[PDB]
């Protein structure tokens, strides 16, 4: 994921 | 203030929307037309990982209940749909349902  | 739970990520057909799914004993539980006791927080602007802002919403269910449901992928999914429809039934939004649960993140910092 891009945000993690 | 309620304690951090997990962080659901979904778009909103206008932007990135994180549902900070948190928990607090104050909220009543429901178990032991199905609805679930949960607060529906007020929007706060948070920055994504990239560096562009987006809208986070702090939704909180019964805490004791929650530690029971964080083990059930089934319950998991059941709460997220509901809440998404709470944010829809209060702000329109028309959130996207193709949502992801972040592996690492459990919040976008700003409980209240």
GROMACS .gro file of C-alpha atoms in nm:
model
  116
    1UNK     CA    1   0.000   0.000   0.000
    2UNK     CA    2   0.105   0.362  -0.057
    3UNK     CA    3   0.024   0.454   0.304
    4UNK     CA    4   0.162   0.208   0.560
    5UNK     CA    5  -1.095   1.044   2.423
    6UNK     CA    6  -1.104   0.692   2.273
    7UNK     CA    7  -0.806   0.458   2.209
    8UNK     CA    8  -0.665   0.380   1.858
    9UNK     CA    9  -0.795   0.070   1.683
   10UNK     CA   10  -0.729   0.008   1.313
   11UNK     CA   11  -0.727   0.236   1.010
   12UNK     CA   12  -0.951   0.172   0.710
   13UNK     CA   13  -0.849   0.338   0.385
   14UNK     CA   14  -1.096   0.410   0.105
   15UNK     CA   15  -1.152   0.680  -0.152
   16UNK     CA   16  -1.462   0.898  -0.161
   17UNK     CA   17  -1.509   0.969  -0.530
   18UNK     CA   18  -1.365   1.312  -0.447
   19UNK     CA   19  -1.071   1.222  -0.221
   20UNK     CA   20  -0.872   0.988   0.003
   21UNK     CA   21  -1.073   0.890   0.309
   22UNK     CA   22  -0.931   0.716   0.614
   23UNK     CA   23  -1.176   0.577   0.869
   24UNK     CA   24  -0.985   0.573   1.199
   25UNK     CA   25  -1.178   0.285   1.361
   26UNK     CA   26  -1.114   0.338   1.734
   27UNK     CA   27  -1.277   0.208   2.050
   28UNK     CA   28  -1.394   0.320   2.393
   29UNK     CA   29  -1.571   0.153   2.691
   30UNK     CA   30  -1.816   0.444   2.709
   31UNK     CA   31  -1.981   0.333   2.386
   32UNK     CA   32  -2.226   0.048   2.454
   33UNK     CA   33  -2.162  -0.292   2.294
   34UNK     CA   34  -2.425  -0.491   2.096
   35UNK     CA   35  -2.377  -0.876   2.105
   36UNK     CA   36  -2.377  -1.179   2.340
   37UNK     CA   37  -3.234  -0.514   1.147
   38UNK     CA   38  -2.882  -0.534   1.296
   39UNK     CA   39  -2.718  -0.203   1.394
   40UNK     CA   40  -2.398  -0.129   1.587
   41UNK     CA   41  -2.338   0.133   1.858
   42UNK     CA   42  -2.065   0.363   1.732
   43UNK     CA   43  -1.987   0.733   1.740
   44UNK     CA   44  -1.941   0.913   1.410
   45UNK     CA   45  -1.657   1.164   1.452
   46UNK     CA   46  -1.607   1.506   1.294
   47UNK     CA   47  -1.376   1.530   0.989
   48UNK     CA   48  -1.010   1.624   1.035
   49UNK     CA   49  -0.758   1.702   0.766
   50UNK     CA   50  -0.463   1.464   0.768
   51UNK     CA   51  -0.170   1.429   0.525
   52UNK     CA   52  -0.129   1.105   0.336
   53UNK     CA   53   0.205   0.926   0.311
   54UNK     CA   54   0.283   1.106  -0.013
   55UNK     CA   55   0.240   1.454   0.129
   56UNK     CA   56  -0.103   1.556   0.013
   57UNK     CA   57  -0.389   1.622   0.250
   58UNK     CA   58  -0.705   1.419   0.292
   59UNK     CA   59  -0.999   1.363   0.517
   60UNK     CA   60  -0.985   1.134   0.815
   61UNK     CA   61  -1.291   1.042   1.026
   62UNK     CA   62  -1.266   0.911   1.386
   63UNK     CA   63  -1.533   0.639   1.440
   64UNK     CA   64  -1.545   0.462   1.780
   65UNK     CA   65  -1.718   0.138   1.890
   66UNK     CA   66  -1.744  -0.030   2.228
   67UNK     CA   67  -1.390  -0.101   2.340
   68UNK     CA   68  -1.440  -0.437   2.520
   69UNK     CA   69  -1.644  -0.555   2.223
   70UNK     CA   70  -1.376  -0.433   1.982
   71UNK     CA   71  -1.090  -0.655   2.112
   72UNK     CA   72  -1.329  -0.946   2.037
   73UNK     CA   73  -1.390  -0.835   1.678
   74UNK     CA   74  -1.031  -0.751   1.590
   75UNK     CA   75  -0.977  -1.129   1.559
   76UNK     CA   76  -1.270  -1.194   1.329
   77UNK     CA   77  -1.218  -1.096   0.963
   78UNK     CA   78  -1.591  -1.133   0.935
   79UNK     CA   79  -1.688  -0.891   1.213
   80UNK     CA   80  -1.405  -0.668   1.089
   81UNK     CA   81  -1.571  -0.629   0.747
   82UNK     CA   82  -1.916  -0.591   0.902
   83UNK     CA   83  -1.827  -0.284   1.110
   84UNK     CA   84  -1.645  -0.102   0.831
   85UNK     CA   85  -1.937  -0.113   0.588
   86UNK     CA   86  -2.174   0.018   0.860
   87UNK     CA   87  -1.953   0.310   0.960
   88UNK     CA   88  -1.895   0.403   0.597
   89UNK     CA   89  -2.272   0.436   0.571
   90UNK     CA   90  -2.278   0.646   0.886
   91UNK     CA   91  -2.037   0.891   0.728
   92UNK     CA   92  -2.253   0.878   0.419
   93UNK     CA   93  -2.576   0.924   0.615
   94UNK     CA   94  -2.432   1.235   0.777
   95UNK     CA   95  -2.210   1.396   0.516
   96UNK     CA   96  -2.324   1.242   0.190
   97UNK     CA   97  -1.971   1.172   0.068
   98UNK     CA   98  -2.068   0.857  -0.124
   99UNK     CA   99  -1.757   0.676  -0.004
  100UNK     CA  100  -1.596   0.409  -0.213
  101UNK     CA  101  -1.642   0.056  -0.072
  102UNK     CA  102  -1.325  -0.087  -0.229
  103UNK     CA  103  -1.145  -0.011   0.094
  104UNK     CA  104  -0.823  -0.143   0.233
  105UNK     CA  105  -0.723  -0.196   0.592
  106UNK     CA  106  -0.369  -0.068   0.641
  107UNK     CA  107  -0.127  -0.329   0.777
  108UNK     CA  108   0.094  -0.082   0.967
  109UNK     CA  109  -0.113   0.228   1.046
  110UNK     CA  110  -0.380   0.220   1.319
  111UNK     CA  111  -0.465   0.595   1.304
  112UNK     CA  112  -0.397   0.933   1.140
  113UNK     CA  113  -0.305   1.115   1.458
  114UNK     CA  114  -0.576   1.323   1.632
  115UNK     CA  115  -0.805   1.139   1.875
  116UNK     CA  116  -1.062   1.356   2.062
   0.00000   0.00000   0.00000
